[PDB]
C-alpha cells in the first residue's frame, strides 16, 4: 500500500515513561516527518511539547533514529525511516493528575 496509514497506539510517573507509539506505514514511502501539535510547543522541530489535561515528546532512542531535519514550507521537521515505530514519552525528570490528555501528531510523507 503506497498510501500513508498512521497509527497512534496508547501504551508520579517513571522517568521518560512511555505513553504512546507511532507507526507510519507505506510500501512506497522512504521517509516521513512528524511534529507534535500544541498550543505550547517547546522547540523548532515540534518533537517536545506541553499538553493540557504534562511535558511530552519523542524518546531519546526515537530521536536518535532521525535521518535529517528539513525545513519544509517554513517549518522544521525531523524525518524518519518509513514503517518505523517511534515512542512518545513524558519528557524530562519523573513528572507527577487524574485526567484525559490530548495528544496530536501531524505526519507528512513525500512519495518517491
Amino acid at each position: 500500500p503506497q498510501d500513508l496509514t498512521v497509527s497512534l497506539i496508547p501504551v508520579k510517573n517513571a522517568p521518560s515513561a512511555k505513553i504512546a507509539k507511532l507507526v507510519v506505514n507505506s510500501t512506497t514511502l522512504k521517509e516521513f516527518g512528524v511534529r507534535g501539535i500544541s498550543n505550547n510547543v517547546v522547540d523548532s522541530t515540534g518533537t517536545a511539547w506541553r499538553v493540557a489535561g504534562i511535558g511530552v515528546g519523542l524518546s531519546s532512542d526515537s530521536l536518535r533514529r532521525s535521518d535529517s531535519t528539513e525545513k519544509w514550507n517554513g517549518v522544521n521537521w525531523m524525518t524518519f525511516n518509513s514503517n518505523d515505530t517511534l515512542d512518545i514519552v513524558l519528557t524530562g525528570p519523573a513528572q507527577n493528575t487524574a485526567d484525559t490528555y490530548p495528544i496530536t501528531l501531524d505526519v507528512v510523507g513525500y512519495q518517491p
Binding site: 497512534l8 514550507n73 517554513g74 490528555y101 490530548p102 501531524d106 505526519v107 507528512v108 510523507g109
Partner: protein
C-alpha cells in the same frame, strides 16, 4: 483506543503534459466518518509557490467517499527544454488516559513536461553516466527528465539514499557494475538498466 488514520491518492505521481487542459488525481477517505481535506501545490523545494491550482482546494469527504481533484497550470514561466517538478499535497484532518488524534499530509510529485520534451525518462535512462571514486558514487543525468531511481545496486549491493536526479543534473552519494530501474510515469518500475565499470 488506538487512533488509525489514512488518506488514499489514486497515484504516486501526476505527469502534467504541457499541451493538456489539466490533470486529475483521485482522493478517497478510507475512514468510516467524514474528513476535511486541503490540497495545495508547492514548488520542487516543497516551500515556494508553484503556478498551479488544485480544484477544489478545500473540501469535505464523507465516510468512504472518493472524489477527483483537478490540477491546472495557471501561468508561470517554466522552462521549455526540461521538466519542472512540483509537489501536490493532500492534507487530511479528522474530527476531534490519552485522547489521541492525527492529521496527515500525503504529497506526490507533480511533474511538468514541456511539449518539446519528447518520450519518457525510461526511453533515455540508459544515458545516465556513473562515476565511482572511493566511497563516492555519482550519477550524471544529461537528459531533460527527472530520473526517479529505484532498485539501485552496485556490485549487487543495494544503494539506498540516492535522491531523485533532476534534469541536466548530478547526484553524489557516499564497487562494480551498477544496476537500476526508474519509476515510470505510471508508478511501476522499468526494466533494469546496467552500467559497467
Amino acid at each position: 483506543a488506538t487512533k488509525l488514520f489514512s488518506v488514499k491518492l489514486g497515484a504516486t505521481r501526476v505527469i502534467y503534459h504541457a499541451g493538456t487542459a489539466g490533470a486529475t488525481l483521485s482522493v478517497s477517505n478510507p475512514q468510516n466518518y467524514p474528513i476535511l481535506v486541503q490540497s495545495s501545490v508547492k514548488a520542487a523545494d516543497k516551500s515556494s509557490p508553484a503556478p498551479f491550482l488544485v480544484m477544489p482546494p478545500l473540501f469535505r469527504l464523507e465516510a468512504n467517499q472518493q472524489s477527483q481533484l483537478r490540477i491546472v497550470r495557471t501561468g508561470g514561466d517554466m522552462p521549455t527544454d526540461r521538466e519542472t517538478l512540483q509537489w501536490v499535497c493532500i492534507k487530511a484532518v479528522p474530527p476531534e488516559t490519552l485522547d489521541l488524534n492525527l492529521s496527515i499530509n500525503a504529497c506526490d510529485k507533480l511533474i511538468f513536461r514541456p511539449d518539446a520534451v519528447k518520450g519518457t525518462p525510461e526511453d533515455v535512462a540508459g544515458n545516465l553516466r556513473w562515476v565511482e571514486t572511493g566511497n563516492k558514487l555519482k550519477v550524471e543525468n544529461p537528459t531533460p527528465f527527472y530520473m526517479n531511481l529505484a532498485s539501485v545496486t552496485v556490485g549487487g549491493k543495494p544503494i539506498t539514499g540516492l535522491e531523485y536526479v533532476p534534469p541536466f543534473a548530478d547526484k553524489t552519494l557516499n564497487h562494480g557494475d551498477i544496476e537500476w530501474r526508474v519509476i515510470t510515469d505510471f508508478g511501476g518500475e522499468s526494466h533494469p538498466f546496467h552500467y559497467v565499470l
